[PDB]
Amino acid sequence: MLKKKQLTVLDLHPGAGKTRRVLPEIVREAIKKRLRTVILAPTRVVAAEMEEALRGLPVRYMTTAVNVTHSGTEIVDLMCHATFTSRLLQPIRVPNYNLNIMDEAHFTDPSSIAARGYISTRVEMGEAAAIFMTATPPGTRDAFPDSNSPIMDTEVEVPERAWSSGFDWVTDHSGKTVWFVPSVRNGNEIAACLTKAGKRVIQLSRKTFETEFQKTKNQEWDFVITTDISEMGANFKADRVIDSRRCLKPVILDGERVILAGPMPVTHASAAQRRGRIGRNPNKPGDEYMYGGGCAETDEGHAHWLEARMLLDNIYLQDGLIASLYRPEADKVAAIEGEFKLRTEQRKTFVELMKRGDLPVWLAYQVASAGITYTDRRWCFDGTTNNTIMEDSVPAEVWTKYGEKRVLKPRWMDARVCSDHAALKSFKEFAAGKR
Ligand SMILES: C[C@H](O)CNC(=O)Nc1ccccc1
Ligand SMILES: C[C@H](O)CNC(=O)Nc1ccccc1
């Protein structure tokens, strides 16, 4: 496994112990063999759980999710997927990792896809070894994999709106339920209905995940309402998953705008991970998985794979060579390797628009490749009339950095900057020059 030129997919079923049992064995072996190693966690929550599994072992934690005093002698680095790719985009000396370990390696956010592409390319070049840990590798077709204890699988109509009758089984349940919704806004409406019905609800999404996930440990709850972020190794003490089996898909239309298409079916991988939240306790058989639709391979044509190519085109590898996407996910996007390579100053703008600007990759690329500098926000206001962003059914307005009240009307429209109240608030702050 640890030998150079080898990429290993550790595809044990969900809950089989990849993170708590196998990972520490690999790390002890890597240290014995003096292999410089990186461990990539999908989330800060997983990074902290890895610290518990790896406690005692000399690991440098490159995350403020862990409070450790390092020795400076560690040859094993641990960071989130996004941090790895983020540092690769910056003028930062990159250690030669002989061994590259990615946990929850099914994660489809652009920076995770890019990290797999960089790593697998280095393995293909004979420069390194890699281990990708996931029950659901790219292209998996089995939504119902093995579990630690038997699961009751039931195809059932699942509400996606508030309801007054017809779904008694949802609220008649006395255990804890994890409910996967297609979007934050959808989750808000279901959560309000459950709260009105007397349930205690916690809501999880990408921007709130680390903070809100702690509440699943610190307080009593009946329902966790979550987007697909909880597919990435989030552990709950639950006995039921309700799965809409739906997600939103960012889709680039006519190379000029990004829409959030759907809700549409999840992939088999996603469905298996959603289901995989339960059936984890061999002493508690009969956890329930209620699913409200079929699976489809909706990662095909999904903007994240094009965005991953934008990131990798702007990461140095060797001379003019450019890292390929990991082979099993390399034909998901029509994309020409190298087509998004930016010159020095535009590439720095691109990085800053993602890092400080917090803009989606695709949108950051449009701005940077247009030769616009980071602090120049005129593009947020000079788009066509159908790019007007709406707030409470009237055009959203901000005061520009010049002190002028203007309608938010970006030259490039990416629906992710206004998909919920929090997103729009952050984009308004950006348009105003506030970061
Ligand atoms: C997101 C991360 O917190 C940012 N970077 C780090 O923490 N970097 C780091 C920490 C310890 C040793 C060497 C490097
Ligand atoms: C003190 C340690 O060597 C810090 N480790 C790293 O800086 N790791 C790193 C740097 C660039 C890209 C990806 C990963």
DSSP letter, residue 375: T
Nearest atom, ligand 1, residue 64 CA: 3
Residue 14: name the closest of 380, 362, 222, 269 by CA.
Answer: 269
Q: Which one-letter amino acid corresponds to residue 405?
A: K
Ligand nearest the Cα atom of residue 79: 1
What is the C-alpha separation between 43 and 50, in angstroms, rounded? Answer: 11
Rounded distance from Cα 63 to ligand 1 centre (Å): 5
Structure tokens belonging to residue 343: 């010159």
The residues near 202 (Cβ < 8 Å, ≥ 6 apart) are: 212, 215, 216, 219, 221, 223, 224, 225
Q: Which two tokens stand for residue 302?
A: 């999904």
SS3 call for 284: coil
Residue 12 among known ligand-binding residues: yes
**Same domain as 156, residue 125:** no
Looking at all shown ligands, the one closest to residue 65's CA atom is 1
Judgement on whether residues 44 and 113 belong to the same structural domain of the protein: yes
Q: Within this chain, do residues 270 and 213 fall inside the same structural domain, yes or no?
A: yes
Q: Which of 251, 252, 213, 250 is nearest to 229 (CA)?
A: 213
The whole domain housing 163 covers 151-291
Same domain, 157 and 56: no
Same domain, 245 and 187: yes
β-pairing verdict for 129-133 and 151-155: unpaired
**369 CA to centre of own chain:** 25
Three-state secondary-structure class, residue 265: strand
Going by alpha carbons, the residue nearest to atom 11 of ligand 2 is 94
Question: Which atom of ligand 1 is least distant from the CA of 80?
Answer: 1
| Non-local CB neighbours of 316 within 8 Å, separated by 6+ positions | none
C-alpha to C-alpha distance for 222 and 174, rounded to whole angstroms: 8
Alpha-helical (H) ranges within 59-177 are 81-88, 110-124, 168-171
CA 264 vs CA 25, 140, 173, 181, 298: distances in Å: 40, 18, 27, 11, 8
Atom 11, ligand 1: residue with shortest CA distance? 62
CATH of the domain at 27: 3.40.50.300
Calpha distance 204→202 (Å, rounded): 7
CA dist., res. 361 & res. 188, Å (int): 26
Q: Which two tokens stand for residue 156?
A: 């059932």
Name the β-bridge partners of 264: 247
Residues 200 and 270 in one domain: yes
Residue from 39, 89, 93, 98 whose mutation best tests the ligand 2 pocket (most atoms within 8 A of CB):
93
Q: Which experimental technique did the depositors report for determining this structure?
A: X-ray
- Based on the domain organization, do 128 and 179 belong to the same domain? no
Q: 81-105 in b/e burial notation, b at 16+ Cβ within 10 A?
A: bbbbbbebbeeeeeeebbbbbbbbb
Measured distance CA(150)–CA(347) in Å, rounded: 50
CA distance 241 to 178: 5
DSSP, res 37: E
DSSP 8-class letter at 91: S
Same domain, 105 and 49: yes
**Side chain identity at 210, as an amino acid letter?**
E
Reading the block at residue 299, the tokens are: 């990662």
Contact 326, 120 (CB under 8 A): yes
DSSP 154-215: EE----SS--SSS-HHHHS--S-EEEE-SSHHHHHHHHHHHHHTT--EEEE-TTTHHHHHTH
